């Protein structure tokens, strides 16, 4: 397997930690992990590059949103492996929909 992670961060309150991992090169990713600091609502997921959102998470009264999914479009490996590319987290759920938040760069562990 291949694994890696994004520790997001920004000035605000927004933090978080997104786990990406992948059994077989050939195979989708899980994506899964967590962010706090939010403001009650919808958010969203989004890789420098990408053209759309990775997917869409909505936060607890307590600022806190919770997400795991699969994605077998990207992969951690070949030459559009995301490792090294950014996440972002972002207002209003879409691809370009809303002021970025906190951000990481998606490393390998």
């Known amino acids: ?18 786990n ?3 059994k077989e090169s050939n195979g989708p990713v899980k994506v899964w ?6 403001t009650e609502g ?8 990408a053209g759309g959102d990775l997917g869409n998470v909505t936060a607890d009264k307590d600022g806190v949103a ?4 699969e994605d077998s479009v990207i992969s951690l490996s070949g030459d559009h ?4 590319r950014t996440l972002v987290v972002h207002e209003k759920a879409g691809a370009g929909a809303g002021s970025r938040l906190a ?3 998606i490393g390998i562990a």
Do not use: M, R
């Not at 919808?42 to 590059?49: A, I, P, Y």
């Open 66 to 69: 919770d997400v795991s999914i």
């Open 81 to 84: 492996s995301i490792i090294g």
């Open 103 to 105: 951000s990481g760069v």
């Open 33 to 38: 992990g967590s962010i706090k600091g939010l």
């Open 1 to 18: 397997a291949t694994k890696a992670v994004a520790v997001l961060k920004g000035d605000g309150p927004v933090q978080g930690i997104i």
């Open 42 to 49: 919808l958010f969203g997921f989004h890789v420098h590059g």
């Open 20 to 22: 990406f991992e992948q």
